[PDB]
Amino acid sequence: GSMNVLVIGSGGREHSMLHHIRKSTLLNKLFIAPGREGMSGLADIIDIDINSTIEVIQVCKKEKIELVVIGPETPLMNGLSDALTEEGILVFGPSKAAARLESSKGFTKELCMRYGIPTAKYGYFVDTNSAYKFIDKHKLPLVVKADGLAQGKGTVICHTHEEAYNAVDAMLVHHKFGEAGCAIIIEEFLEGKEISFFTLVDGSNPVILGVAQDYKTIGDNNKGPNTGGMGSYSKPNIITQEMEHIIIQKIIYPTIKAMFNMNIQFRGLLFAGIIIKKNEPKLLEYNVRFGDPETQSILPRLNSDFLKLLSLTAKGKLGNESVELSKKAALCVVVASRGYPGEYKKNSIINGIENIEKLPNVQLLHAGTRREGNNWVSDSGRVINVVAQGENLASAKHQAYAALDLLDWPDGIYRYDIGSC
Secondary structure, three states: OOEEEEEEEOOHHHHHHHHHHOOOOOEEEEEEEEOOHHHOOOOEEOOOOOOOHHHHHHHHHHHOOOEEEEOOHHHHHOOHHHHHHHOOOEEEOOOHHHHHHHHOHHHHHHHHHHHOOOEOOEEEEOOHHHHHHHHHHOOOOEEEEEOOOOOOOOEEEEOOHHHHHHHHHHHHHOOOOHHHHOOEEEEEOOOOEEEEEEEEEEOOOEEEEEEEEEOOEEEHHHEEEEOOOOEEEEOOOOOOHHHHHHHHHHHHHHHHHHHHHOOOOOEEEEEEEEEEEOOEEEEEEEEOOOOOOHHHHHHHHEOOOHHHHHHHHHHOOOOOOOOOEOOOEEEEEEEEEOOOOOOOOOOOEEEOHHHHHOOOOEEEEEOOEEEEOOEEEEOOOEEEEEEEEEOOHHHHHHHHHHHHOOOEOOOEEOOOOOOOO
């Protein structure tokens, strides 16, 4: 291969991306900034501040980078993609203007209203007077969300009006989520089957990548606060091919076309949260980049070349193209530091990683580790992923959880219901 590739980010999603980019015959040299030491087998780790456009550009010139693959949302919101494009560097990820689909949840809701895209009824607010008056006319339960990038944690289901007042104060008045909470949306609570729906979009042509089941809450059986995501799986027929088509026609294409026509075309990975009831999909939310940890379960199933797909997307060349997925089930369990999504302990010593990495049927990803002396220690809220594949979901599940029995980390927390009915 002749393509030098730079991945931006440092979590389990990116470690998975590296693993799968490394399979391409198109790849020459592979880099990650800032990455993590546990990923160093796959790529050269670059220690830079990725919030500095200028530092990222300097790495691209120094290393002759031909494609940049942006993992997380914040640099997209900060216009890293625009800064790279202005320098004539190919980038997989949307422009700042296109990234508003995620960086303002209210942006997406208005677009849905204007273009007739099915979604939750809602209101948008910047002060508790208007918010409380909406709460008081509104049916329960309802969902309060930070408008900005709250890493999936600024989303609270409220079953009493008092819980809603508290959620709205925490964001608008007490500033508990920084600028991300300076505005909010309050939405009707929708029932049904929730899925994660990944589409590659080259500016005008959508190509479905895959579907996964997510696990948002910290606790099993959907209990406790919302997190960035505590697990995932992907397998054939989570939804029918017909439903896939309805989602593209009613939600994704109208989104792509609206953005294109306002001259803010979307290019990259469009990740829709979708809820299905009475055979009809509604849009929960947009993320404008790969989902963590849904990516970890979808990529194992990809028969098509992942790097080629990223490059073609970035180039505006998905016109003829299609994705091929295997019939395997894949499943990812996240191990978090105790306290997450709240305050968590860093520097906790983690034992068993080397034993799990010796297993041939599973992959351990370094989502949030670092080295301190001779130990692996905790360094983020989400610390380890274990990923497995099988002929069916039960096999994939058994293998993941069998591997996790080798983990000896009393401060580690993981759900036991990843892949359960």
